[PDB]
Structures are given as structure tokens and as C-alpha cells.
């Protein structure tokens, strides 16, 4: 009776009448003749945002099936109600729902040429590749207009221009997970990420990287986003690309690494950064020229070499590569520190899991390392070794005269750190070597007071 009154109000968008008529008892009522549709089904299909809002507040089922297997989202998609589509997606209707023929809402909008619905669905993770019972995908049944969207090639000039002009909202208007690694038709044949990286669109890069942009995508001449960023000296975006797995020695068709690009254009600070991420300045290109060759400044030539040995040593030290350490060894490089962490090669050696780490520590000290060098939070190598219970190297550090009671940022000794981690044999040895237990930290704790029962046992014999 009065169910028919509601379903008619839902088509017209008479919000007042839907308010009056609808309640929990009938909000999900099926039209028992014809399509077997819900009130939400009708409202959604007719583009009634306000009726849809109120229906959803009254507990309208967004996964309700009609007789054909459709979902209110199917209905809104067929008739291009991108406002109502966005609203149903937000309540959790999945954009890859299957009707009885396995048409998804993306089939329904691609068939009907609905571009705004297509992009909204793809942004919410719709699948172009789901096939119906006749084996046909959304792209196969697509309208000639909507076919351009489902190949990731739509307003692609406008998408690319937004990326290089730094236009956040006009990018996110067009950006599907498909048009994110598109290439330009001509010129350099760059991707969105290439351009954003080249033109220093730090925010556009974050959005592209989030939405699946390819950090490895090559342009016409072999380059990758990192080449563009380094050439023009964008530290912000260079660091961001590296963070997301960019290959630091990636090579184009002429075998230029990013460090070649940076060094030739005297980007002192990007070179510094790249070297710390494992860049190799001795790598030659097609024209037999290294990064050191292409550096114009004589300061950059020596700094590229100094910083390279430095890192190359630190790395050898941490994978305890004893042979590698014996090679890369002058006094200038021994005490080389890591720009950020302030970690000398000795800190890296005593923290190595690898089996030759005692011998690397020994050699580095024989070759004249600073046994009490502090790292960024004032920890000596003894602290680093002691908090890991790398006890073998503590013999070596002690022999070369490490201060056992060197204090860190919080006034804690090595013993405090060991006691805290529960390292029982470390504690024992640290005392044998001479760590005073009675030292109070800046917070009022002895090593004993930080440790478990077993640690206290050991430390209360003094």
C-alpha cells in the first residue's frame, strides 16, 4: 500500500515525504513487482543526493541486491550521478560488485559513456579488468569516450601539465591509478613523476608516489625521475625519491648516473646526499667520463673522492668486509663521520652482525681510529657494542683505551645500557673492564636500578 508511496517519493526526490514515510520497518523494503528494488536503489538511480543521505541515516542497506544482482552503486553509475556515487562509495559499497551477469559498476558507467563516474570509481579502486559472464571487460564494452579513461590516456595532456605546473587539485581531479605512469606523446616522453621531480613539485611527488607512480619509469632517452631531480638540484625531492626505492646509480642510454647529472651541474649538496645513499663517482659513462671528471669545481672533485671513500669504508665496516677495509684506508678517511648519524667506521664495525667484526674493529684501531668517538647522541663504540651484547669487540676497545665510563646524552654509561637490555654477560664483562656501577644517570638511576632481577644480582657484588 504505502510502500508504493515511498518508492515514488524516492524517484521524485520529495525529501519531506520520504522523511514522513520511511522508518526501520520499510527502509530496505523490496518493490515486490518489477525490478525488486530497494528505496535506495531508486533514489540512487535517480540522483537524489538528499534522499540518499537520509535513507543512509535510517539504516538503508548499501549492499542490497535487486533481482538482477545490482547494488544501488550500479544504478547511480548507469545514470551518471557522480555526487551520489561518491556518497555510496563512502558508505562502503564496493566498486567491484557483481550482478548476476558479473557486470561491475565500472562496466555500467563505461558502457553509458559516464566519464565522471568512471574516474571516481577508478580512484576508489575499481577494476577495469573484471570480465562479465560473456568474457568481456569494462574496456571491451566501453563507450568510445570512456575507452580513453580505461586506458589511462584521458585529459593526459592536462594531467601532465598539472604535474609540472604544481597544480594539486587539478591533478587529483584527473589522476586514476591507470593514468599515473602514462607517458607524454612527444618531446622527452616523460611521466608525471619525471616532470614533478624535475620542476620541484614536492607535494605533487608525494601524491604521485602514494598513488602508485613508478620511481623506475624511463623516458625516451633512458632517464628516470631521479636523474631529473639531481640535474636541477632539488634536495627535497631527491631525498623523497630515494626513500621510495629509487636506484641511486641508475643508468640512462649513455650510462650517466644521477651523480653524473648532479656533478656536472655543480650540485654540491645533492652529490653529498647521493654518495651517502651509495652513489659511485668512479662509474664511467659512454664517453669514458666519471662523475669526478665531470665535476667543474676542484672542491667538488676532492669532496666527491673524500666522501666516497668515507662511505665506502663505513659500508665495508658494517658488513665486516675485512679485505675491503684494508684497501680503503688513509688517516683522513679512518675517522670519517656520517653526515646525519655522526657514525665513524668504528661504530659501524662494533655493531656488525657479520662474523669478522672483531678483526675489523682491531684493524681500524691499529690504523688509528678514535676509540672514544661520539655519535649523534653521544654514544661511544663501547655503548653501541654494549647495548647489543657484542661482547667480543669490547676486549679490543678496552685494549685500545676506551673510556668505560663515558657518558651519553642522558648521563648513562655503557653499563646502564647493557643492564637495561638485560645483557648479563655484557654487564659482567663491563665490570671486569672497569665500569663503575654507582654512577647515577641524569635521571637518577644507577645501572642496577634500570636492570631486571638477574642484572641486580650481578651488580650488587661491588
Amino acid at each position: 500500500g504505502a510502500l508504493r508511496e515511498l518508492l515514488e517519493a524516492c524517484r521524485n526526490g520529495d525529501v519531506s515525504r520520504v522523511k514522513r514515510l520511511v522508518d526501520a520497518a520499510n527502509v530496505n523494503a523490496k518493490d515486490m513487482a518489477g525490478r525488486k528494488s530497494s528505496p535506495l536503489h531508486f533514489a540512487a538511480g535517480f540522483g537524489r543526493k538528499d534522499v540518499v543521505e537520509h535513507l543512509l541515516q535510517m539504516g538503508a542497506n548499501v549492499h542490497a541486491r535487486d533481482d538482477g544482482g545490482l547494488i544501488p552503486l550500479h544504478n547511480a553509475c548507469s545514470f551518471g550521478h557522480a555526487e551520489v556515487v561518491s556518497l555510496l562509495l563512502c558508505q562502503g559499497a564496493d566498486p567491484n560488485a557483481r550482478d548476476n551477469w558479473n557486470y561491475t559498476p565500472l562496466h555500467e558507467a563505461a558502457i553509458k559513456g559516464k566519464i565522471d563516474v568512471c574516474i571516481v570509481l577508478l580512484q576508489h579502486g575499481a577494476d577495469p579488468n573484471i570480465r562479465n559472464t560473456d568474457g568481456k571487460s569494462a574496456l571491451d564494452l566501453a563507450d568510445p569516450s570512456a575507452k580513453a579513461v580505461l586506458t589511462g590516456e584521458y585529459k593526459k595532456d592536462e594531467l601532465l601539465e598539472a604535474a609540472r605546473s604544481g597544480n594539486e587539485e587539478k591533478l587529483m581531479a584527473l589522476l586514476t591509478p591507470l593514468n599515473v605512469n602514462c607517458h607524454a606523446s612527444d618531446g622527452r616522453k616523460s611521466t608525471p613523476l619525471h616532470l614533478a621531480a624535475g620542476y620541484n613539485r614536492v607535494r605533487i611527488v608525494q601524491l604521485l608516489l602514494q598513488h602508485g607512480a613508478d620511481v623506475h619509469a624511463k623516458d625516451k632517452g633512458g632517464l628516470v625521475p631521479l636523474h631529473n631531480a639531481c640535474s636541477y638540484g632539488h634536495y627535497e625531492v631527491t631525498e623523497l625519491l630515494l626513500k621510495h626505492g629509487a636506484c641511486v646509480n641508475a643508468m640512462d642510454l649513455w650510462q650517466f648516473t644521477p651523480l653524473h647529472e648532479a656533478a656536472s651541474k655543480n650540485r654540491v649538496e645533492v652529490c653529498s646526499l647521493l654518495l651517502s645513499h651509495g652513489a659511485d663517482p668512479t662509474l664511467v659513462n659512454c664517453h669514458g667520463k666519471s662523475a669526478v671528471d665531470m665535476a667543474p669545481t676542484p672542491e667538488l672533485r676532492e669532496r666527491l673522492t673524500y666522501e666516497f671513500k668515507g662511505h665506502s669504508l663505513l659500508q665495508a665496516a658494517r658488513e665486516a668486509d675485512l679485505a675491503k677495509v684494508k684497501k680503503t684506508l688513509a688517516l683522513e678517511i679512518i675517522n670519517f663521520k656520517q653526515p646525519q648519524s655522526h657514525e665513524t667506521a668504528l661504530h659501524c664495525a662494533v655493531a656488525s652482525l657479520h662474523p669478522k667484526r672483531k678483526q675489523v674493529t682491531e684493524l681500524l684501531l691499529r690504523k688509528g681510529a678514535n676509540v672514544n668517538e661520539k655519535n649523534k647522541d653521544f654514544m661511544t663504540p663501547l655503548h653501541v657494542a654494549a647495548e647489543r651484547a657484542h661482547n667480543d669487540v669490547m676486549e679490543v676497545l678496552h685494549k685500545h683505551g676506551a673510556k668505560m665510563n663515558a657518558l651519553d646524552t642522558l648521563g648513562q654509561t655503557a653499563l646502564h645500557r647493557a643492564a637495561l637490555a638485560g645483557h648479563l654477560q655484557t654487564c659482567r664483562l663491563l665490570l671486569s673492564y672497569g665500569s663503575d656501577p654507582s654512577i647515577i644517570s641524569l635521571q637518577g638511576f644507577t645501572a642496577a636500578q634500570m636492570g631486571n632481577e638477574a642484572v641486580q644480582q650481578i651488580l650488587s657484588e661491588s
Binding site: 609540472r164 618531446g187 622527452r188 616523460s190 619525471h194 616532470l195 621531480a197 624535475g198 620542476y199 620541484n200 623516458d219 625516451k220 632517452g221 632517464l223 636523474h227 631529473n228 631531480a229 640535474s231 636541477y232 638540484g233 632539488h234 642510454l253 649513455w254 647529472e261
Partner: peptide, 11 residues
Amino acid sequence: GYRQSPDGACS
């Protein structure tokens, strides 16, 4: 093709 400067700019 033949080698370019890459896409992007300084300022």
C-alpha cells in the same frame, strides 16, 4: 633519439 637536457628547471 639524440641526447637532451632532462625535463625540469632550476627556479
